[PDB]
Amino acid sequence: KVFGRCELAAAMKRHGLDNYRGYSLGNWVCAAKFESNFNTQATNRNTDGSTDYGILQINSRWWCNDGRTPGSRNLCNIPCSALLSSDITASVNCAKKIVSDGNGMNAWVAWRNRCKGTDVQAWIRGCRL
Template sequence: MRGLVFLLLVAAASAKVYQRCELATILNDAGMDGYRGTTLADWICLIKWESNYNSSAISGNFDGSTDYGLFQLNSRWWCDDGKTPLSRNGCHVNCTVLLTDNIRPAIVCAKRVVRDYTWLRSWSGWRNYCMGRDLSSYIAGCKL
């Protein structure tokens, strides 16, 4: 348990709250725009409503699992936090890796969610605030 607490403290120390356009540039460079039919605006909207652009965001769920990082990737399905029973760890990462300013592992995992499951519908933030809406404001003014 001490090890997990230490890892969470280290992750929090290197976490970052991104600016919208800064994040849009990073995601664009990582090939997120157009990935499996998604748009860059979809991703920025999703991240806004899931984590408010905060790479250290953590949220508990009713089933005892936890959501981690910018994309709020769930410990039951996508990462191993060492405490969620029967974690599938579909991205083969420790959840603390998703809490730093190195968002490459989070991007790789988010792509896997989209590739292997139901596009962006896996995220309630996207379903509730982004799906079927004009999202152009999420990348407006960004020099991409």
């Protein structure tokens, strides 16, 4: 599924991500925009042999099981394929674990390089939330 911007904002808010770990909704929408272009089906191989999955590009070395990643810990206890569903529940639940792991949203490369420190409120401008 390719979400619209406000569509994803609404879903993320319903699932409790606005201000989760102190990260405003705009931070999570900006992260999704630059990680996946709001596409639940997005996948991208990493050099270490892991792959990132879904709207928040969750990695198969630590978080989800894809059956082909050396060193995989599956800390979200989910198949990586679950993170590609049109239903974002699994991605949200796993993202909550990741952002709680110590370094906050810095886990998300694209957030750190493209969202952190910017006017992230713009990402929810116009939305009825």
